[PDB]
């Protein structure tokens, strides 16, 4: 039961790309984030 077979319904095509990073996952269990895009 604890399987979580997750199917991706995010995109149809995904190609020609530069970055790819993998780590331990980021995530009543409040979870807070701040995203910001400064100088690249």
């Amino acid at each position: 039961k604890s399987w979580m077979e997750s199917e991706f319904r995010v995109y149809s095509s995904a190609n020609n790309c530069t970055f790819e990073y993998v780590s331990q996952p980021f995530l009543k269990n409040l979870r807070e984030f701040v995203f910001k895009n400064i100088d690249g």
């Epitope: 077979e5 199917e7 991706f8 319904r9 149809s12 095509s13």
Partner: antibody
Amino acid sequence: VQLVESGGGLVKPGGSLRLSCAASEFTFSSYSMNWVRQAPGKGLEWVSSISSSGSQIYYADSVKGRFTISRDNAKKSLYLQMNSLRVEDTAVYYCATNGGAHSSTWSFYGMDVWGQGTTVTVSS
Amino acid sequence: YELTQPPSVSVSPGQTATITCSGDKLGDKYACWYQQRPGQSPVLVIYQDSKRPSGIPERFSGSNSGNTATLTIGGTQAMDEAAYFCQAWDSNTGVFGGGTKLTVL
């Protein structure tokens, strides 16, 4: 969606065909397609299957190296290249959607939308 | 992998039908069932061994355990006379059952 097939006709053994299964709506994009052939005297056989993206393609043991399933979500069409049509390939073929996006989720669904089948006959 | 279905079974109208499907460790897998009335494209009637698709009356009851998949039809009527294909997926391979024909008198 609403499915219509085409392409089945009279060919001799070893010949070439190219079936089709056209969709009405663009919801076709969200459906993993399956090809199922129905014998003139028996039930159904699974022929092939393709993912919603089209990158997860599988064939039955009796048909690999001969058939080539392909699709076009922008064209809302599903094809099936039909080469080395061989003695027991005479049947009626059904195009059936699964719903599961990838082969890992096919077991969680079933083939729900079938179009009108197309009759394929091989004989000398 | 093969799924074994009896060639045919029959019950009188208004009775309860029971059609079996056998496979190796088949109770660990998801099985779908379809109705093929003669001259007709099949229709899905049971999937995930317990759930019932939209548009199907509740008398189409299916269950799975061990090496047998079973479908139960209480209050069988005339148009339950159809070919019944037990389906299952194993290693990304669509394998269909034999197909049990149900006959109502």
